Design a protein around this ligand. Sequence first.
Ligand SMILES: CCCCCCSC[C@H](NC(=O)CC[C@H]([NH3+])C(=O)O)C(=O)NCC(=O)O
Ligand SMILES: CCCCCCSC[C@H](NC(=O)CC[C@H]([NH3+])C(=O)O)C(=O)NCC(=O)O
Lengths: 219, 221
Amino acid sequence: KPKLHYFNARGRMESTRWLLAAAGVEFEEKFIKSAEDLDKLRNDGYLMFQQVPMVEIDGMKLVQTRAVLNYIASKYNLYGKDIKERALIDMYIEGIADLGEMILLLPVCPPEEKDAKLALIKEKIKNRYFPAFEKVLKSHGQDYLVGNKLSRADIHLVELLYYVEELDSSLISSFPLLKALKTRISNLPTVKKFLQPGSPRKPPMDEKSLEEARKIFRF
Amino acid sequence: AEKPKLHYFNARGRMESTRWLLAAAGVEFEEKFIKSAEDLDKLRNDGYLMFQQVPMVEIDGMKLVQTRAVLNYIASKYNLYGKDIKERALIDMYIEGIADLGEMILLLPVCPPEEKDAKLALIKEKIKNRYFPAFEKVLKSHGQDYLVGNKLSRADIHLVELLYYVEELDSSLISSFPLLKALKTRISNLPTVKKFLQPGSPRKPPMDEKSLEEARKIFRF
Ligand SMILES: CCCCCCSC[C@H](NC(=O)CC[C@H]([NH3+])C(=O)O)C(=O)NCC(=O)O
Ligand SMILES: CCCCCCSC[C@H](NC(=O)CC[C@H]([NH3+])C(=O)O)C(=O)NCC(=O)O
C-alpha cells in the first residue's frame, strides 16, 4: 500500500488522497504532528527537499505534489491515452492547481490581505476558470473533460468544485455543465465512497490545524 | 508542418524554461512578442488563451497554455522525460524542487522593496542548504553524467538553467558543490545548449527594471 506522509490536514496532500481514492487504491497515512515528527523524516533522509507531501509507493520516496500526482495518474490510467491527451489534461489541471493554490493558501494570507484575496478568488472563478471549464464541456458535449473517459482532470476539477462550494455555493450556479459534472463524478462508486463520512477525505482547515501547521513547518 | 510558436512578452519570466527546453531538444521555434496590454487582449479576444494568460505555445495544432502543460508535452515528445513512469517520477521530483527555487527567483523582482532583502537572504540560505545539497546528493549517488536514467533529460536542462540564474545571483553559491559545477559545464557543452548559450539566440537577458515595467503595463499589475 502507498503510504502518505503529511500532517492531518488538507494542505498539499488532499489532491493525492482524492486521486488515489478515485482510482480504487487503498493507502496508509502516517501523520506528522510535531516539528520533530518532521525532523525525523528529514534526518532519516526520507525527504529529498526536507519537505512533505512525501509518498512511499513502488519503492520510491516521492516528494513534490506533482511528482506524486503525475505518477499515480499514469500508473492508474488516469492520464489520457497519448501525449496530446496528457497535454490537454495538463493544461486543464494546471489551471485548476493555480486556482487551487489560491484557495489552499487563503488561511496563511496576512489577515489584511484576506478580504481583497477572497474577492479576487471569487472573481477569477466567475470570469476566468469556470467559463473555461464550461467551454470545454460544452465544446464536446461529453461526460468527461478529455477523451470521453474518466481522467485526473475530472478528479481534480471536481475536488476544486467542492472547495468552491465551501467558499460560496452561488458560484457554480450559472455553470450548469459543471454542476452536471460535479454530480456524475461524485456518483462514481470510488469517489462516492471517498465523499462519505469516515473516509480519509479531510475537512476544511480550521484555526488549530493552521496553528499545528505553523508549529510543524516552522512558519 | 509548422515551427512551434511561443507567445509571451520579450523576457525570461515564465517562458524561459520552454525556450531552454525546446532549444536543448534542438527544436527551432518562432516567438511572438506581446508588447502591450492591447497585444494580450487580442490573444484573449481571438480565443487563443484557455485562462486568458500566457505562456502560450502553439505546437501540434494545440494552443497550450500553462508552463507545465507546455514543458511536459515537449519533454515527452523529444524523449526528455525518462524512459518510463518510475523515471518520470524522479524527473518530476527533481524538476519540481527546481521550479520551487525558480519561482523564488523569478518573483523576487516583484517583492515589495521592504521584503526584498530578507527574501534574497533566504533564497541564498535555501540554495546552500536545501536545493544544492539535494542535487549534489543525486549526482553523488550514481556518479553519472545526467540526473536521471544516465541520459539527458529535462531534469538536466532545467537544473542547469537554474545554475545560470543562481550564478547571476551570486556566483559563490555553487562553489562547495563540485558535481553541479561539472554538470553545468558538460550540459553547457552539448551542441544544442552551447548554441543556445551563444550570442544572438532566443535565450533572454535577466529582467531589468524597464522590462519589469512593461511586465506591469501588459499584465496589469
Ligand atoms: C495551507 C498550508 C499547508 C501547510 C504548509 C505547506 S505544505 C508543507 C511544506 N511542503 C511544501 O511546501 C512542499 C512544496 C512542494 N512544492 C510540494 O508541492 O511538495 C513543508 O515541508 N515545509 C517545510 C519546509 O519547507 O521547511
Ligand atoms: C515578475 C513578472 C514575471 C511575469 C510573470 C507573469 S507571466 C504572465 C501571467 N501568466 C501566468 O501567471 C500564467 C501562470 C500559469 N500557472 C503558468 O505557469 O503558465 C499572465 O498572463 N497574467 C495575465 C493575467 O493573469 O491576467
